[PDB]
Design a protein around this ligand. Structure first.
Ligand SMILES: [Mg+2]
Ligand SMILES: [Mg+2]
Ligand SMILES: [Mg+2]
Ligand SMILES: [Mg+2]
Ligand SMILES: [Mg+2]
Length: 127
RNA sequence: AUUUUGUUGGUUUCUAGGACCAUCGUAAUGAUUAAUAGGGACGGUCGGGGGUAUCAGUAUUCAGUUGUCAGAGGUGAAAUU
């Protein structure tokens, strides 16, 4: 029936990656980041830039034959935040509205089972 | 050792007092509770109590292979990178 890729969306609080691979993930089909759509660093992670990034990904996906994708959303994870960035919700909605078909959706944020020391010091970063 | 038998002094048994030694007889013969103090034992437990080994887990970083291609990072905004 459909031809599935995997839309690996990495939405941090400084950028948004829309990366579509095959099922294995060893073959990259399209990787458009929110920073390729704006000329200001402060909104590389904006919802607007993620939507534009996803639309360019969907157009590239169509001409290769990818008709559906699975979604693997992730945040920065590790010792840093586990909540997804603001661009991850827009890139997901843009892909669904671009004619691409959606399969399984999963959060694949890396989560430690403890962990290493997190940056900032004992008193945190004082603002 | 007072006292003799007094004519004065020697003799060692009764004697009395210890002080002990054995036997026998008397006797209701002789050991306070177990502290809602403690200690100890014992019986099933219960704990992220300790020590010595041992076995996970993802994460972080670094490296190897792969894939694409222009940015990535970081911030209130940036720049160093
Ligand atoms: Mg400092
Ligand atoms: Mg303050
Ligand atoms: Mg008692
Ligand atoms: Mg015991
Ligand atoms: Mg019980």
């Amino acid at each position: 029936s459909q031809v599935f890729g995997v839309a690996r969306i990495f939405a941090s609080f400084n950028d948004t990656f829309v990366h579509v691979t095959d099922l294995s993930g060893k073959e990259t089909i399209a990787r458009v980041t929110g920073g390729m759509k704006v000329k200001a660093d402060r909104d590389e992670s904006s919802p607007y830039a993620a939507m534009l990034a996803a639309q360019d990904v969907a157009a590239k996906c169509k001409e290769v034959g990818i008709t559906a994708v699975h979604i693997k959303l992730r945040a920065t994870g590790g010792t840093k935040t586990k909540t997804p960035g603001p661009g991850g919700q827009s890139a997901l909605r843009a892909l669904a509205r671009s004619g691409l078909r959606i399969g399984r959706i999963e959060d694949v944020t890396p989560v430690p089972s403890x962990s290493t020391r997190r940056k900032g010091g004992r008193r945190g970063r004082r603002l």
